[PDB]
Write a protein that binds this ligand. Structure first.
Ligand code: ATP
Lengths: 838, 394, 52
């Protein structure tokens, strides 16, 4: 009855949403310069109403007393929607004669800069020249492409033109043609034609033939000649595949160059990684020389007191040959107009408020190009990076879980487990040349991520003009003029203004390495809270969460938590639960009451209560302690078949219980990685007759004191041909085990330990790769412990890709002839220090 | 009293001046000097049940195993059965006053094997075949620290030497005189297991409060740590280009190395950081070989200089525990008949107060001085020198 | 209570302002020769309302 009216209004509300995100997605595409201010204000109000209605729908979905509150809220929200409807109508006009000219390209004048101005461009222009002109001799090699990927303004067109200006006299044709974000194909092809001959094709931009006949014309004009065309700023490769068909004929002696801000489109070119040309930020010395070329006249030591300021500021840009140009031109109107005080003001300004200046916004357009080219469902992901402090590495797992918990990841295919979707989001951010990845974690994937500084402050401002985030920084020390409309709060070094009076609808809150938490701030006052992040704090009082119901992410890494409340079962909605580095050593029984999780970063020291099999949706489990366990609990682990990654260490069940779990593993089929830890023993878990899950990539083994008797039989190229990681240790070793392992397809990472060599009195023998020729197409990382791996397992045509190799070498083989090295192998196999044994 | 440095010299025809007395007196028989009998514990094996019968009323298993241990103490059994006989209680007991007698049950039982080993009653190979067992490693690494803390910590705290308790410098105690075999023979036969057992031992010492702290120990109480610890123990080229879960360990090593190299910060946490660090290199040589940073900080000599300070203070505390007794020797350490009366001994005036001067001259002869070292070496040495010259006459 | 309604109307009034100065800034850009007189009269009236 009463609930019927509410639920019949909810679907109307969600349709309202769908339309409103439709409109907001439409408006945000255009840059905020052609957008009239009235529409901008209207759009901002639309966004605020969108937050309100999302709040109402989430509250109703979580709950089902409350019915009347929901009713009043939804009615009043309808009232503001209705009121705001006709404000747009009431004050609006047409102005047929408003045709202002389209803005010119901000980065065209940069194309017209002095040649004798750029420093350090050398020893990269030459290298790019001879990485493709080396085949120019014997100018009959098949045509190839060399793309140039990079981020921001590290300089691609500059180097492309530099190479384009030296080697041309030895060519018959050529063209330097640009492409915008949304090109017109006929315009592009007219551009190419005009670049070849301006005589026959002077008015080639006039005739409007079609997309096809002019392609035929350009194909015809390209016979029995070497062209060397270069095309730059190609986005959304779907456009590029049109042009590639224009070059579809055999033409020895010609090559072409491409540039783009997406590596995820250059691999679509040149079919090979050796033709991909990464470009790097300049070195510190070259950057210093370039920086002092502008401001200082000819000499550098005259200040001798702002020098440290110079290095400190130049470190912010890193290596970008555009940011430093901008800063140098801004910093001196005429011979050091400023000295050492406003320089500190400038340094403090970056991060929160440097961008709003004069003659500075002309470069921020170049940076926002990339942000605007993003599709939807990715603007929030990029804008989410403003929460974390300036210079701190960000683990990608935290990012993915935060996104999922927030609600930025969703679909309706049902073929996706919703975690790899967020991983795909992250990889798309990376391949767009917008985030720097670092390291490889225990997942087989990238470890953490870092953000460029002048992009960080830029996105900080961009999220700041709306209420997407809120930052409390000492250099900034600013608060929005409306305490009510705060959704995301990212507390940092500042520990003074910690007021919490007027944020009823606080979506998310985080604290970074501060002791101000708790003694000044209260979280329980937040009636709603989506995610909570408190890693690195020194407080153990988290027992008020029972008052919180909408929580999804709960990070407590390194928190000195002694215990957590028994009343946690009320959190039916939850996605992550990290407890690593905490003092608590037993979990409450009220965890079987939980229904939804995907990850559980639990400590093996802690105790896992019985009934773990109920968490069917669980998708990854880390560091499970298996000691003093009964059979039914072990068998429960086979029921929930949703795992991709599992980590196990144990000390107290080395019985047939190992075999009982051994087949229980095979019940799952979604595994990606696995590893087992056990101390100084023979492996009494795995049998030789047990089908493995079809999908396995990592399969690690952390322990080195334990050992297998021999290589397991169930390891074969037949089953599990997805391995890219080996990490084995065993007692014996066989010259046939290596031959067997050389049949698996990928095996990117290889690491084998011979227990008997370093434990018992044994001589490191020389295993022989008998059968086959290569057995190792792509194995870059190979590690042999206690096993003799001489370079002469085969000629260089065995392991094309192998950067690293480790093995042991007896001193008695020095006088032998089995160490016959001296030649250079295909990969970078020149850096090695072998462990030699007397 | 601000006692100055006792400038003396230990030269030829002077080491035997006092060591000759030290070679036969009640102390120093089971110890050594930096300048370089079975009835005693049989009587304790007899007195093993002094107070057990007083409160047997729960408290019956103590006496039940007490007579079994007394039986096995004197009965002659072949080695291939004696281990099984003695392990029947070792593998049986699980866990205030109770534990007190429980530790004596375990501590006295294990000393029998060494007593029979020094008599060549137990074959060396037979002992080797059992010491490699994992459980007795954690048994000994627990009972040693428990036995030390139950008896010596109470008197060490009052003297102010509690802050300078070194886990690695424990075998030199006269009471724990049976560990040289367990250390050296095991090291000669199984070198890796010695470092492994020391690593295990220090973990409990941290947890039981020998080196307490409010912050977690990221180097102990986790098997995955020993994984990399033993992984680099066999490869000479793994620190130059490390792997994952190895940058973090190096970061926590160098962060504490910088803490130790600091001067102004708090001292107790520096003492804490000393213990695990010193445990690290001795068991795992070439682990903090920062070839660049150490040379421009004299770190290699600084570690030895601050290590010798605890060695000196150990013997000073031993002398203090000897002077008043003439129970600070510890419970169940010295039996009543073999006890020491209150009367002053004439041989003390010639071999104790003079020997203190030799000890302090040896302490103050080759230790470097630094503003950080002064707060770590000079100040405690001066405090001990002041305290040692205000109690000898009385 | 009573003041709550007034204060909740004030920010709506502020938004109304912002839109009106948007419109007036838009119209005043063009010279007063291509502007039709109906729009001029409407602009004058909205300006007076803006003052109020
Ligand atoms: N060696 C150099 N010395 C001085 N300025 C340089 C140098 N190299 C590059 N630049 C500057 O970098 C910018 C060139 O940008 P770039 O070549 O990357 O343009 P693009 O390919 O059109 O696009 P984007 O900048 O988005 O990558 C210009 O501002 C140019 O002055």
């Amino acid at each position: 009855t009463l609930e019927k009216k509410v639920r019949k209004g909810i679907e109307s509300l969600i349709t309202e949403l769908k339309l409103m995100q439709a409109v907001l997605s439409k408006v945000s595409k255009v840059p905020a310069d052609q957008l009239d201010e009235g529409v901008k204000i209207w759009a901002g109000n639309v966004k605020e109403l969108s937050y309100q209605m999302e709040d109402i729908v989430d509250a109703f979905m979580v709950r089902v007393k409350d019915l009347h509150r929901i009713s009043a809220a939804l009615e009043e929200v309808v009232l503001q929607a209705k009121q705001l409807a006709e404000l747009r109508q009431r004050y609006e006009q047409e102005m047929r004669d408003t045709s202002a000219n389209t803005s010119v390209d901000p980065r065209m004048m940069a194309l017209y800069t002095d040649v004798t101005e750029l420093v350090g461009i050398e020893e990269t222009r030459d290298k790019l020249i001879n990485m493709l002109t080396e085949g120019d001799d014997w100018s009959k090699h098949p045509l190839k492409t060399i793309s140039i990927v990079g981020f921001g303004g590290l300089g691609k067109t500059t180097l492309a033109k530099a190479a384009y200006d030296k080697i041309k006299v030895q060519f018959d044709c050529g063209a330097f043609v640009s492409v915008s974000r949304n090109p017109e194909m006929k315009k592009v092809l007219k551009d190419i034609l005009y670049g070849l001959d301006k005589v026959k094709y002077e008015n080639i931009h006039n005739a409007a033939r079609d997309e096809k006949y002019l392609i035929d014309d350009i194909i015809e004009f390209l016979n029995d000649k070497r062209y060397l065309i270069v095309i730059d700023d190609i986005w959304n490769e779907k456009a590029w595949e049109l042009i590639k068909c224009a070059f579809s004929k055999k033409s020895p002696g010609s090559r072409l160059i491409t540039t783009t801000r997406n590596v995820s489109v250059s691999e679509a070119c040149c079919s090979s990684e050796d033709d991909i040309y990464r470009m790097e930020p300049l070195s510190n010395d070259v950057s210093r020389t370039l920086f002092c070329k502008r401001i200082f006249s000819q000499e550098e030591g005259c200040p001798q007191e702002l020098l440290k300021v110079s290095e400190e500021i130049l470190k912010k840009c890193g290596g970008v040959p555009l940011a430093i140009i901008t800063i140098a031109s801004l910093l001196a109107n005429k011979g050091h107009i400023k000295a050492k005080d406003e320089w500190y003001a400038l340094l403090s300004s970056i991060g929160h408020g440097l961008t709003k200046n004069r003659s500075l916004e002309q470069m921020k357009k170049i940076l926002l190009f990339s942000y605007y080219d993003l599709p939807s469902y990715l603007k929030p992901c990029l804008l989410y990076l403003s929460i974390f402090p300036e210079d701190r590495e960000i683990r990608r797992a935290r990012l993915i879980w935060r996104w999922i918990s927030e609600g930025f990841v969703y679909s309706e295919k049902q073929d996706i487990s919703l975690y790899e979707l967020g991983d795909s989001y992250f990889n798309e951010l990376v391949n767009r040349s917008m985030i720097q990845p670092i390291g490889i974690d225990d997942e087989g994937k990238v470890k953490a991520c870092r953000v460029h500084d002048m992009v960080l402050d830029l996105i900080c401002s961009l999220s700041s003009e709306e209420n997407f985030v809120t930052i409390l920084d000492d250099p900034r020390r600013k608060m929005p003029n409306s305490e009510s409309k705060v959704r995301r709060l990212s507390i940092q070094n500042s520990k003074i203004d910690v007021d919490t009076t007027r944020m009823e609808h606080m979506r998310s809150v985080t604290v970074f390495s501060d002791n101000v938490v708790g003694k000044v701030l209260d979280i329980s006052r937040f009636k709603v809270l989506r995610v909570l992040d408190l890693e690195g704090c020194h407080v153990s009082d988290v027992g008020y969460v029972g008052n919180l119901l909408h929580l999804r992410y709960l990070g407590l890494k390194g928190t000195h938590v002694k215990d957590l409340p028994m009343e946690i079962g009320k959190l039916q909605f939850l996605l992550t639960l990290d407890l690593r580095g905490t003092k608590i050593e037993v979990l409450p029984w009220s965890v079987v009451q939980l229904r939804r999780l995907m990850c559980l970063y639990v400590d093996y020291g802690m105790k896992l209560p019985s009934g773990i099999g109920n968490l069917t949706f669980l998708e990854v489990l880390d560091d499970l302690g298996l000691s003093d366990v009964d059979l039914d609990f072990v068998k429960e682990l086979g029921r929930l078949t949703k795992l991709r990654v599992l980590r196990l260490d144990f000390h107290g069940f080395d019985q047939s219980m190992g075999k009982a779990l051994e087949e229980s593993i095979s019940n799952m089929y979604k595994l990606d990685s696995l590893d087992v830890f056990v101390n100084r023993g023979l492996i009494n878990c795995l049998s030789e007759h047990w089908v493995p899950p079809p999908r396995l990539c990592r399969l690690a083994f952390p322990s080195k004191r334990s050992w297998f008797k021999t290589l397991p039989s169930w390891i074969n190229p037949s089953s599990l041909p997805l391995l890219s990681y080996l990490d084995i240790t065993l007692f014996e070793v066989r010259s046939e085990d290596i031959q067997l392992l050389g049949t698996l397809p990928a095996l990117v990472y290889l690491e084998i330990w011979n227990y008997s060599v370093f434990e018992e009195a044994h001589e490191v023998e020389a295993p022989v790769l008998s059968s086959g020729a290569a057995l190792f197409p792509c194995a870059t990382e190979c590690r042999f412990i206690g096993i003799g791996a001489v370079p002469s397992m085969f000629p260089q045509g065995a392991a094309p890709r192998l950067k690293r190799l480790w093995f042991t070498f007896p001193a008695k083989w020095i006088s032998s002839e089995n160490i016959g090295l001296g030649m250079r192998h295909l990969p970078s196999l020149q850096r090695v220090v072998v462990d030699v044994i007397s | 009293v601000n006692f100055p440095f006792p400038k003396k010299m230990i030269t030829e025809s002077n080491s035997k001046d006092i060591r000759e007395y030290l070679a036969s007196t009640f102390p120093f028989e089971q110890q050594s000097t930096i300048l370089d009998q079975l009835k005693f514990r049989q009587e304790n094996l007899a007195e093993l049940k002094d107070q057990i019968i007083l409160s047997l009323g729960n408290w019956q298993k103590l006496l039940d195993y007490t007579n079994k241990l007394d039986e096995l103490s004197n009965t002659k059994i072949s080695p291939e059965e004696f281990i099984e006989e003695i392990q029947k209680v070792l593998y049986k007991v699980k866990l205030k006053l109770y534990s007190q007698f429980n530790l004596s049950i375990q501590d006295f039982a294990l000393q029998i094997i060494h007593s029979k080993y020094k008599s060549n009653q137990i074959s060396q190979n037979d002992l080797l075949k059992l010491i490699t067992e994992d459980e007795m490693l954690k048994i000994l690494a627990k009972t040693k620290v428990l036995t030390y803390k139950m008896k010596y910590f109470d008197s060490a705290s009052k003297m102010g030497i509690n802050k300078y308790i070194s886990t690695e410098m424990m075998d030199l105690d006269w009471q724990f005189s049976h560990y040289k075999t367990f250390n050296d023979a095991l090291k000669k036969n199984k070198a890796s297991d010695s470092s492994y057992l020391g690593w295990l031992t220090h973990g409990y010492s941290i947890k039981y409060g020998l080196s307490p702290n409010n912050e977690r120990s990221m180097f102990f109480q986790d098997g995955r740590k020993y994984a990399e610890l033993y992984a680099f123990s066999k490869s000479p080229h793994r620190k130059i280009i490390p792997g994952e879960h190895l940058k973090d360990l190096l970061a926590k090593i160098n962060k504490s190395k910088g803490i130790f190299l600091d001067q102004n910060a708090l001292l107790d946490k520096r003492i804490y950081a000393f213990h695990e660090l010193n445990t690290l290199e001795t068991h795992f040589p070439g682990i903090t070989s920062s070839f660049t940073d150490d040379l421009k900080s004299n770190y290699r000599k600084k570690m030895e200089s601050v290590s010798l300070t605890c060695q000196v203070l150990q013997e000073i505390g031993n002398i203090h525990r000897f002077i008043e007794s003439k129970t600070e020797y510890g419970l169940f350490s010295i039996p009543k008949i073999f006890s020491i009366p209150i009367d002053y001994k004439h041989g003390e005036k010639e071999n104790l107060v003079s020997y203190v001067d030799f000890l302090y001259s040896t302490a103050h002869e080759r230790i470097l001085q630094d503003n950080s070292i002064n707060q770590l070496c000079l100040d405690p040495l001066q405090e001990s020198l002041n305290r040692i010259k205000s109690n000898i006459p009385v």
